[PDB]
Design a protein around this nucleic acid. Sequence first.
RNA 1: AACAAACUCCUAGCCCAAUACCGGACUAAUCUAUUGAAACAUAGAAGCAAUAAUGUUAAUAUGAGUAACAAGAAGCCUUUCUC
RNA 2: CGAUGUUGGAUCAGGACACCCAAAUGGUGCAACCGCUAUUAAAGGUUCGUUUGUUCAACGAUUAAAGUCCUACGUGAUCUGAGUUCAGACCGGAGCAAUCCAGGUCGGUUUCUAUCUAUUAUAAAUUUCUCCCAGUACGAAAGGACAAGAGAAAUGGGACCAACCUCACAAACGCGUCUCAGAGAUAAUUAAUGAUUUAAUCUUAACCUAAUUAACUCAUAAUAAAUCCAGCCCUAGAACAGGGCACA
Lengths: 110, 118, 148, 153, 99, 279
Amino acid sequence: AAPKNRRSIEVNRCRRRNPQKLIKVKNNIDVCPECGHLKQKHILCGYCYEKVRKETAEIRRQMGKQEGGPFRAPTTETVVLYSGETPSEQDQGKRIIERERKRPSWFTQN
Amino acid sequence: NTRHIAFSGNKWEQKVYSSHTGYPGGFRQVTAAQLHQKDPVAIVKLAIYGMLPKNLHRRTMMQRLHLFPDEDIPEDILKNLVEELPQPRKVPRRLDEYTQEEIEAFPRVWSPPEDYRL
Amino acid sequence: TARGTASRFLTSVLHNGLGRYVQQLQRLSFSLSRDAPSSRGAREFVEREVTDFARRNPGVVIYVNPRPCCVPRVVAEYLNGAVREESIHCKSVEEIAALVQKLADQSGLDVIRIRKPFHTDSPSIQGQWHPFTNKPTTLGGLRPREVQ
Amino acid sequence: ISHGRVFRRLGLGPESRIHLLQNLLTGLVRHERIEASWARVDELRGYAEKLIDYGKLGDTNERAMRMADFWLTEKDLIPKLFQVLAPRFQGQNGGYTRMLQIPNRNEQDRAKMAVIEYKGNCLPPLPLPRRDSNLTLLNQLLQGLRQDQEASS
Amino acid sequence: VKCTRARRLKKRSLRTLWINRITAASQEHGLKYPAFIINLIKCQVELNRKVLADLAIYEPKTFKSLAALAKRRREEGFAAALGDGKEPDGIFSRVVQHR
Amino acid sequence: HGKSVTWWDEHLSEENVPFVKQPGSSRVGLIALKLGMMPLWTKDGQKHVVTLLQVQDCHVLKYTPKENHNGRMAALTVGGKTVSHFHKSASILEFYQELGLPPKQKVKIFNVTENAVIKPGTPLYAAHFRPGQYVDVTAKTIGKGFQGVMRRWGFKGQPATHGQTKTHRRPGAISTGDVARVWPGTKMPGQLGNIDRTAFGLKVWRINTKHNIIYVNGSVPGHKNCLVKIKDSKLPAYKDFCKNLPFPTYFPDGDEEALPEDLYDENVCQPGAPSITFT
RNA sequence: AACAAACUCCUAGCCCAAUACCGGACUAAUCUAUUGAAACAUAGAAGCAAUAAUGUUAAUAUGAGUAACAAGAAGCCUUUCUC
RNA sequence: CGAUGUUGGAUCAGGACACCCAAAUGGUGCAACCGCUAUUAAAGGUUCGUUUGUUCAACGAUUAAAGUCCUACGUGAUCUGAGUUCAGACCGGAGCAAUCCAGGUCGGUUUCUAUCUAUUAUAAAUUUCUCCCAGUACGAAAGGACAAGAGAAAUGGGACCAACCUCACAAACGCGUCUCAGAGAUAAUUAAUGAUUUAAUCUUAACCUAAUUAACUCAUAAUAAAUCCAGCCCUAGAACAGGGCACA
Ligand SMILES: Nc1nc2c(ncn2[C@@H]2O[C@H](COP(=O)(O)O)[C@@H](O)[C@H]2O)c(=O)[nH]1
Ligand SMILES: [Mg+2]
Ligand SMILES: [Mg+2]
Ligand SMILES: [Mg+2]
Ligand SMILES: [Mg+2]
Ligand SMILES: [Mg+2]
Ligand SMILES: [Mg+2]
Ligand SMILES: [Mg+2]
Ligand SMILES: [Mg+2]
Ligand SMILES: [Mg+2]
Ligand SMILES: [Mg+2]
Ligand SMILES: [Mg+2]
Ligand SMILES: [Mg+2]
Ligand SMILES: [Mg+2]
Ligand SMILES: [Mg+2]
Ligand SMILES: [Mg+2]
Ligand SMILES: [Mg+2]
Ligand SMILES: [Mg+2]
Ligand SMILES: [Mg+2]
Ligand SMILES: [Mg+2]
Ligand SMILES: [Mg+2]
Ligand SMILES: [Mg+2]
Ligand SMILES: [Mg+2]
Ligand SMILES: [Mg+2]
Ligand SMILES: [Mg+2]
Ligand SMILES: [Mg+2]
Ligand SMILES: [Mg+2]
Ligand SMILES: [Mg+2]
Ligand SMILES: [Mg+2]
Ligand SMILES: [Mg+2]
Ligand SMILES: [Mg+2]
Ligand SMILES: [Mg+2]
Ligand SMILES: [Mg+2]
Ligand SMILES: [Mg+2]
Ligand SMILES: [Mg+2]
Ligand SMILES: [Mg+2]
Ligand SMILES: [Mg+2]
Ligand SMILES: [Mg+2]
Ligand SMILES: [Mg+2]
Ligand SMILES: [Mg+2]
Ligand SMILES: [Mg+2]
Ligand SMILES: [Mg+2]
Ligand SMILES: [Mg+2]
Ligand SMILES: [Mg+2]
Ligand SMILES: [Mg+2]
Ligand SMILES: [Mg+2]
Ligand SMILES: [Zn+2]
C-alpha cells in the first residue's frame, strides 16, 4: 500500500517522542565494593571478571604449555601454586601448575 | 418532580426515542412511555440536551444541570438555591379540588327532566 | 489582520486634553539634499512653509539638514518617547505640508488596531448589573424550600 | 501456544540443538568453566547436572559408558570424567554447577552472557555476589530479635 | 478574504449580541423585546440597540425606567384600542412635532 | 532523589535468611484450587467426570453493607490460597495486618443477603457444600494468547491445494462495500483465552473432609492449579435448594460430632461397593 | 409585532462586481545617457517579475529508523568439536 | 477513459419483509389428518450430491424449511480463472484476398512492504425426534387430533483433557467430555362491564379487566482490595502488561 498524504512533523514528533519509545532509566546501578567501579546488582562486575578471566587465560596457557598434545587429558586432579609456594601433602598426587607471579589478594590458598 | 412529567396529546405512545449501540442489529427504538418508566430523568435530559446549541460548551453546561425524579434533593444542593422559577403551564384542577362556593357560584346551564335515570 | 498584528486600547497618555491640551509632538528633523532632484519638494518646503509652521507651532523644534543623501526623510519624535520615520522622497509641496500637518496633529502612540472606539474610567455610574439587582427579597431571606 | 514446553528452540533444529549443547558440554567438561549466551548455558545446566549423575553410576555401567561416549565427543574426557569429576562429587545431591550472569559482550551484538562452572575447579574464584556482614545495621537489629527469641525459649 | 467577509459580518454579529442583551434585560423586568422596542419608539425616544444594551448593562435604574415607560405605553395603547374612540388621548400618546 | 530499587532479600545475610523464613436468600461462596480430573461411576452403569476442587485456605475478609455496595444484597469479601508476605503491596499487608491473617492470592466479592452475613476473619471448609447440589464455577480460562480467527471464532478456512495464494487461514471479506467501514461487531483476530468465564449447573458428587475436596461434574473453566470461585447455582430451576443446607454456614465447632470422611451422593458407586450386578 | 442583504438612508470619502477579448494609469529588478553619492531623478533599451507545464537541475523531507541484509561452537587464539 | 479491474464460486456476511420453517390468530366448498387463503412478527436458521464455467435448470436422497431481494446485481490492496476479454491454432460459413463470428472448440503473467479512517470476545439459547395423551377427541368406515407432561438428540454460544485418538516435550487438539436460564412487555386476534345511540356493541368513550408471537429491557452472573516490583519461574505472554519466589 502507498501513503495517501505526507505525515507532518507534529504527528512525527508525537510518534517519536512518546515515552514507550524513549530509553528507560536503570535504577540497579551500584558501585563494586572491591574495585569501586560500576556494576548492576544482578550482574557480576566487569572489571573483576576481567581480572579473573585474564588470570584464567594465563593459567590455561601455561598448562597447555606443559602438555604437548590436544588429545591428552589429566587422569588426576590439578592444583595451582605461585612463586614461593610448595605443594602440600594433601595436594600431592595431583598435577602441579607453577606460576612466576605472586599469589593474588582475591585468590586464596585452599 | 421529573417523574410527574406530562405530554400534551398522544405523545406518550406516539413519540419514540431511538439510539444505536454501533454493533450491527443494535438499533433501539423505545417508546417515550417505556423510556420514562425505565429512566425518569431521560426525557427532560434529552430535551434540554437537544435544545442546547451544538457547540463544545454543551457538555459543560449539562454538567451544571441537576435532575431529580421526586422531591428528594441533597441538602448541599438545597442550601445553594436562590429562587424558584414559575411553572410555564397553569395546572388544571379536577372536580374534587373545586370548593362548593364555586360549585354553587357556577350557574346551571340546563334543567334535566325528572323522569330520567342517570 | 487583527489576529496577525498586535492591538491596543484607545488611550490618551498622561490624560491629555483633560485639564489642558499639550501638543505632544516634540521635534522634526528633515534630512534632505541641495543637489538631488528627489529633494525638490523638501527644498521648496524649507523655502516657503517651515518658518510659517514654526510660527504656528511654538512647541516643536524643527531641524533642517542638507547632506549628501539620496532619499529625503523626516523624523518626528514625540513627548511619549516615540520616534517615527517618514519618507518625503519626490512629493509636491502641498503633499509635504499635509504630511507635516498630519504628523503634527497626531498624539504619538503606535498606529495599530484599536480594540474599542471609546475609553472611559468609572463607567459604573448609579451601579452595575449583578444578578441580584432586580430580584426581590423574600421575607427572612428564605430559600424556596427552606422552612423556618 | 507454548504451554508445558521446557526445551527452547536453538540452532537449525532438534539435532542441531543437541549438537550445539553437546559441544558446550564437551567444552565445560574439558575446561571446567566456560562462558556463552545465557539461554544456551541455561539449557546446558541440566545436561551438566545429569552428566555427573550418569558418571556416578560407575565405570562398568554400559549405559553410562555409551552416554558419555556420545556426549563427550573428545575421547580423552571420558576417563577424565570417570576418574576426576565423579569421585570429586560424592556428598552433595544436586549442587554440581554454578551459573552466573556475565555482562554483555563487547561485540556489536550486545548479547546476554552467562558463565557456567563446576564446584571445586582449579581456577581463581569468580566475583560472587557477597551478602552483607552480620555487623551491618539491619543484620544486628535482626540478631537482637534472634537473641530475644532464644531467651524466650 | 475571510477578514473582509467577517468584517462585513461583524456588524450583524454585534447587533445580534445587542438584541440578545436587550431581550435578557427586558425579560428580567417581565417585558418582551418587540413590545419594548415598539413602545419605546411610540414615545418618540430614538435610542439605538447598541446604546440600549449599554444602558441595560451599566444602568439598571435607567433601563428599569425605560422598561416602565414601554410598559406604560403598551398599556396605554391597549386601553386606547379597547376604548374605540378618538376623544381620549393619553399623556404619553400625544405626538410632539418639531420646532 | 534517585533512590535505587530494593527487595526483601537484598540486605539480608545467610545467617538471617532462615531466621526471617522461620426463601430467596443466597449463601457465601468459596475459593478453591482446581487439582485435576477423575472418572466416577453411577449405580445405573454410566460414567461421569469429576473435577477436583481443593479448598486450602478460605477466610472471609471484610463485609460491605447493602446500602454501600449495590442496594439489594450485601457484599462479602473472600480470599484464596496463602502467599508470601514479601511480594505483596504495602497497603495490602497493612490491611491484612489489621485483619490478622497472612496474605492471600486472589480476592473475590460475593453477593450475599443480609440474613447470611458472616463475621469477618472466619474460615470456611468444603463441607459448606453438601453432596448433591448445583454450583456455578467462575475462573480465568486457559489463555491462548493472540490467536487467529480460525481458532478464536471457528471460521471455515479457504482450501489449501486448489491454487489459493497466501490465504489459507485468513478471514476473507470483513465488511460490505457500500458502508465504507467495518462494523464494531466484526469477528477479528486478537487476544483469546485470558478472560473470566462461568460454567453453570455443575453437580457435586462427593465431599472429602480431611483435604477439603469438592468433586464437581463436568469441566471447570481454567487450567489446573488455579484459583476457582464457587457459588451456588443461580439457574431458575435450582433457586429453592437452600433449605436443607447448613445455612448460617458450615460450623465444625458447633456440631461437636465428626462428619464422615467421604460424603457421597446416593447415585455414586463407592470405592467400597458390592461390585454391582444387574437383575 | 419583532428578527432578518451587495437594497436604501446616516457620518466621511479616493463616489459602484465580474470570465474570453479590448482600452488606460502606474510600477518591482538590471544596463546605458546625463543628475546623484547613506542608492536616487528625467529619459533610452530589453534574456524586464512564476503558488502550478505527471516541468529541468541540486538538496531535503514523508513513507521510515520501516522493508530488507549477516559471522556454526568452545578455548590455551588459531588448537580441537558439529554438519 | 493522466483506469470506477468484469461472471460464477471460496471465506465473511450487514440489512429489508413482499415470511420458506419455527410462533400467535381469522375465514373456509374447515367433521379429523392433509390443505387453500388472510393478518402480526426478522432474536435464529434456510442441507448434501451428478451434469454444466455457469446464474438458472433437470434429477437422487433428505429436512422444521431448503424464502425473494438490496448491498459497485456485497466481497479479486483476502482468494480462485473454467468461461468471457489480447497475441497461437483448427471446423462450418462470408469475402478474390487480407481478415471476419450474443458460432463452436485446446492453450493463455491476476502486482502491492498498510500512510489515514474503521475494527480487533461480557452472558442471561433455538429447533427436531420418540413415550404417554389414545388409536382418545372427530367420524358411516377408511382414517385420525390439539393442548399438558416425561425423555433423548442436533445446531449455536461458552468451556475442558479422567478415558479414546492425533501424540518420540510435562502440552495443544477432536473424532472425545461438560453446561445452557426467570419476570414484565407486546402486534394481529378473542372475550367481561358499559354510553353517545337508557336495546345491543372488545373502548382512535372512560374505569378497572383478562387470554395472548417474536423482539426489547431487567432481575441474576462476571469484573469491581490504588502507588514493593531489581532479578528467576510460569499452565501469563509478540513488546508492554499479569500471577508466583515463607513452608518443601
Ligand atoms: N459564448 C459565451 N460564453 C460565455 C459568455 N460569458 C461567459 N461565457 C463562458 O462561461 C464560462 C465562465 O463562466 P463564469 O465562471 O464566469 O460564470 C467560460 O466558459 C466562458 O467562456 C458569453 O457571453 N458567451
Ligand atoms: Mg534461530
Ligand atoms: Mg456598509
Ligand atoms: Mg498462554
Ligand atoms: Mg480446510
Ligand atoms: Mg496462481
Ligand atoms: Mg499455499
Ligand atoms: Mg502469485
Ligand atoms: Mg461512509
Ligand atoms: Mg439589517
Ligand atoms: Mg449600491
Ligand atoms: Mg456571464
Ligand atoms: Mg526607468
Ligand atoms: Mg524571463
Ligand atoms: Mg521560485
Ligand atoms: Mg510523482
Ligand atoms: Mg514546478
Ligand atoms: Mg527517518
Ligand atoms: Mg532494528
Ligand atoms: Mg509501517
Ligand atoms: Mg524484518
Ligand atoms: Mg551463516
Ligand atoms: Mg473509465
Ligand atoms: Mg488520479
Ligand atoms: Mg446474514
Ligand atoms: Mg407456520
Ligand atoms: Mg408483515
Ligand atoms: Mg434473517
Ligand atoms: Mg460440490
Ligand atoms: Mg460484484
Ligand atoms: Mg443490476
Ligand atoms: Mg441496482
Ligand atoms: Mg471476480
Ligand atoms: Mg491480488
Ligand atoms: Mg476490494
Ligand atoms: Mg479455452
Ligand atoms: Mg498446457
Ligand atoms: Mg496485508
Ligand atoms: Mg497501524
Ligand atoms: Mg402432543
Ligand atoms: Mg381402525
Ligand atoms: Mg457445543
Ligand atoms: Mg345496556
Ligand atoms: Mg356480545
Ligand atoms: Mg445488567
Ligand atoms: Mg506481578
Ligand atoms: Zn568490581
